[model samples]
Target: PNLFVALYDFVASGDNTLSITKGEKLRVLGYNQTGEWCEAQTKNGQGWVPSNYITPVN
Candidate 1:
């Protein structure tokens, strides 16, 4: 678990309407074993997001 930032806006889909905006900071809660998706929390809310859309806050 670590901090991450959205690279771009993530639109809502059938998987989950949870969206994130570019440059938004998120607290990564968990990541899939394959690293395809990750769960994160933000001031907007919490949901699963594509791993490719976010970058670790190093």
Candidate 2:
């Protein structure tokens, strides 16, 4: 039952390395400066996540 987003799709989560964990949803505007994970949105908030963790929803 785990839903997922596409390779280029967007998702929302908390900043594992920063900020609070409100578990919001973002359009994945882009990736972090580290060129690793990506930047997401949640209720206007932002977070970083590993690209591999993201998957396309069926």
Candidate 3:
């Protein structure tokens, strides 16, 4: 997984979602194969967040 940072707040659009606040660092585990959500590891848990919500690392 690569490093990511939430550019805006993510409030878990689904029951199986992994939500986070803006400025939170993230570790993007994977995406799409599990549906429209990408597995992002945040302080919340290792679940799903939208790929659009995150920013790429340096």
Candidate 4:
């Protein structure tokens, strides 16, 4: 996993969200929960919303 993030749903294009798109790189920080403290730099911006909302790609 090269990155981590929260909110694993469809994020708007300019909402500083990690849009739920294929090939999205995420680093699961496995903390408070499956995705409690995850984060990453997306095409939009940087933000730590949730963790369980993200997944790691090979």
**TM-score for all models, in order of appearance:** 0.81, 0.40, 0.78, 0.43
lDDT (CA) for every model shown?
A: 0.83, 0.48, 0.81, 0.50
- Model 3: CA > 4 A from native: 33-36
Which residue pairs in candidate 3 collide? none
- Candidate closest to the true structure, highest lDDT: 1
Query: Judged by TM-score, which candidate is best?
Result: 1
Q: Evaluate residue 10 in candidate 4 and report its C-alpha lDDT on the 0 to 100 scale.
A: 51
- Residue-level lDDT for 20 in candidate 1: 91
* Model 3 TM-score (2 dp): 0.78
* Model 1 vs. true fold: TM: 0.81
lDDT of 2: 0.48
Q: Total clashing residue pairs per candidate?
A: 0, 7, 0, 8
Model 3 residue 41 CA deviation (Å) reads 0.5
- Candidate 3, residues 5-43, lDDT tens digits: the string is 988897876788877998889888788874556788876
Model 4 residue 44 CA deviation (Å) reads 0.5
Q: Which residue runs does candidate 4 get wrong by more than 4 Å?
A: 3-7, 10-35
lDDT of 1 by residue, 1-58 (tens): 3888999999757455368999999998887799888887889888888889999786
- Candidate 1 vs candidate 4: the lDDT winner is 1
Q: What's the CA RMSD of model 4 in angstroms? A: 5.1
TM-score of 4: 0.43
